[PDB]
Design a protein around this ligand. Structure first.
Ligand SMILES: [Cu+2]
Ligand SMILES: [Cu+2]
Lengths: 307, 341
């Protein structure tokens, strides 16, 4: 509801009262240079969805808007130990491995790619016109998750993978209240678990958050932007995985054909959308058996690799 | 009867004491009706001003309510119905005049009060009483320009009128030209609208509209007139429509609204008026003056700008919501018919 109210979709239960808050903000910010049209100038970059993200103010305005949503989320009751426990299932470890690189280590760098802008170049002599884009890229990797069943029956589960920064400015483990809002979704997929022990492996390119290269260059987050940049000296990060009970999360009807329903009953950003239950203070004591944490290190290298 | 015509003499020369004689008549006032400053020598006066009078109007000594509240406002002070305190004073005086239910008792109360209360206030209180009593109805009240020219004319003329009247004999007196386009020069583009803003006519229309349709009085009667709310909307709305028209005829754009009260006011205005009742001039407003929180202990004004802003925020909400809430907590709907009113 709140989403439709904020930004104003015709689905808003009362546009007249709660207004067109997000959208009107984009216009105000784009017209500071000529607000009464006396200079016969058009809107700046924040006035077009196509270009809005280029401006730094976008993130400030969208940051504010988020705080308003948060104000609602902090009113919701904390997820109980019960609610995010999966009776029987226990995740005992998660790791990541890239080719030619230590365990629990992600790498990033620059990479040139080519795009034919020929169809867009009006009144230009026909032919090919290739343009070379430089953009962030990450080395391919894969998650390896150790899950124990201890039930006696095949258990269905949702694998939910997020990643956040590890520490604060003072160099300690970030607290939950802070860290919960910095968790970026990395993957969410359905898995069938056999009784006893299960070794789950998942490639970076199978991510349900991402869409392939080919789609962008030739809706989905760009694949090459899946991993944060990190630092040359290495940037410390907590990798988190949760296995939830798919039977509860299931919805009887990038991810097949899009035109019907959102396939997860749980709230979006589900493990961390709400405040912590009493006693919980940091990630390492928020965890239930069916969750796991892992220290990852993100290394950047200022070099241009080919495709 | 005569009484109706005798009240109109009160409007004559508002600051000259009532015993000085109005038109070709004079009042035969009791000594307990004489003002405290003049009463101790009173006799020497009745004689002194007795001359040149055809008629003498008798006046009976009556009970007279307490005129404490009416007398609270200074005699040399300004009077505005916008100021909270003045509203309570006028409404109380109106109540006295209104309360004397015979035309002879009204005449006695008036004659007494006149020289004790603020002229501007007296004029208002009387005007309202006469216009809305049954015995005094359809009576032609003298134009307020003629009784209070100081609110309608450049102060410069007054010392010319005094000169002309003292030096030159009657009959040979030259008409005094009233300056026009005198409040600002051509550096201020606003000066072009003098013929509208400063026109005697339109200022009289505005004053009179608020006479017949006040927003504060007693009971519903003389405030509860059909669709006065819509009237207030429309009349004022037409003022700006007409103003915006006249703007276009002087190569100006449409008047810009007061978006928000914290931003400076670009257009100053020095009105060039001198109140002969207050014996001072009206203050001007400078360019880029800013609205400031009021604390006028005397006038009974303790209002912050944020108070105003809060009222506006709430009114907007109601208008968008489509309904208002009464004191009781119930909802009243701003429908097509009575919404505007
Ligand atoms: Cu936006
Ligand atoms: Cu008005």
């Amino acid at each position: 509801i709140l989403g439709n109210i904020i930004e104003s979709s015709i689905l808003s239960p009362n546009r007249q009262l709660y207004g067109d808050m997000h959208n009107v903000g984009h216009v105000f910010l784009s017209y500071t240079h000529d607000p009464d049209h006396r200079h016969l100038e058009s809107f700046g970059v924040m006035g077009d969805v196509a270009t809005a993200m280029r401006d730094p103010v976008f993130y400030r305005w969208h940051s504010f808007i988020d705080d308003i949503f948060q104000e609602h989320k902090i009113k919701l009751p904390a997820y109980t130990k019960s609610q995010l426990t999966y009776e029987g299932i226990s995740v005992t470890g998660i790791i990541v491995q890239s080719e030619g690189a230590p365990v629990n280590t992600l790498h990033t760098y620059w990479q040139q790619s080519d795009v034919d802008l020929s169809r867009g170049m009006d009144f230009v002599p026909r032919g090919n016109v290739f343009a070379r884009f430089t953009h962030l890229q990450h080395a391919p990797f894969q998650y390896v998750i150790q899950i124990d069943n201890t039930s006696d029956a095949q258990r269905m589960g949702f694998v939910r993978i997020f990643m956040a920064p590890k520490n604060d400015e003072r160099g300690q483990p970030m607290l939950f209240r802070d860290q919960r809002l910095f968790m970026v979704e990395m993957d969410k997929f359905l898995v069938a678990l056999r009784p006893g022990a299960n070794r789950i492996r998942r490639r970076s390119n199978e991510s349900t958050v991402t869409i392939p290269f080919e789609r962008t260059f030739r809706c989905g987050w760009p694949a090459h932007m899946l991993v944060p940049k990190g630092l040359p000296e290495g940037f410390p990060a907590d990798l988190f995985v949760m296995v939830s009970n798919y039977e509860d999360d299931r919805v009887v009807q990038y991810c097949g054909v899009r035109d019907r329903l959102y396939p997860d009953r749980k709230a979006m950003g589900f493990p961390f959308d709400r405040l912590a239950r009493t006693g919980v203070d940091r990630l390492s004591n928020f965890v239930t058996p069916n969750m796991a944490i892992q220290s990852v290190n993100v290394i950047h290298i200022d070099k241009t690799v080919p495709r | 009867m005569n009484y109706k015509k005798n009240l109109l003499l009160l409007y004559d020369r508002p600051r000259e004491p009532i015993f000085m004689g109005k038109g070709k008549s004079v009042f035969d006032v009791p000594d307990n009706y004489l003002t405290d400053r003049y009463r101790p020598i009173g006799p020497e006066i009745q004689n002194r001003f007795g001359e040149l009078a055809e008629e003498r109007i008798p006046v009976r000594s009556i009970a007279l309510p307490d005129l404490r509240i009416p007398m609270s406002l200074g005699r040399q002070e300004q009077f505005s119905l916008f100021i909270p305190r003045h509203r309570k004073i006028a409404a109380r005086l109106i109540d006295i005049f209104m309360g004397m239910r015979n035309i002879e008792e009204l005449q006695s109360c008036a004659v007494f009060a006149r020289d004790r209360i603020n002229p501007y206030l007296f004029n208002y209180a009387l005007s309202v009483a006469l216009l809305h009593r049954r015995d005094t109805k359809n009576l032609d009240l003298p134009s307020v320009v003629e009784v209070f020219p100081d609110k309608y004319v450049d102060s410069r003329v007054f010392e010319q009128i005094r000169e002309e009247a003292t030096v030159v004999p009657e009959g040979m007196r030259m008409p005094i030209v009233i300056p026009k386009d005198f409040t600002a020069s051509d550096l201020d583009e606003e000066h072009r609208l003098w013929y509208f803003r400063e026109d005697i006519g339109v200022n009289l229309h505005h004053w009179h509209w608020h006479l017949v349709y006040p927003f504060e009085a007693s009971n519903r009667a003389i405030v509860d007139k059909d669709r006065r709310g819509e009237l207030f909307y429309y009349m004022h709305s037409q003022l700006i429509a007409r103003y915006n028209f006249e703007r276009f005829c002087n190569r100006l754009q449409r008047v810009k609204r007061l978006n928000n009260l914290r931003e400076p006011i670009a257009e100053g205005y020095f009105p060039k008026l001198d109140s002969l009742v207050a014996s001072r001039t009206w203050p001007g407003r400078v360019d880029n003056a800013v609205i400031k929180d009021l604390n006028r202990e005397l006038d009974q004004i303790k209002q912050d700008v944020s108070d105003l802003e809060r009222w506006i925020d709430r009114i907007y909400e109601a208008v968008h919501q489509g309904y208002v809430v009464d004191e009781s907590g119930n909802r009243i709907f701003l429908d097509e018919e009575k919404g505007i009113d």
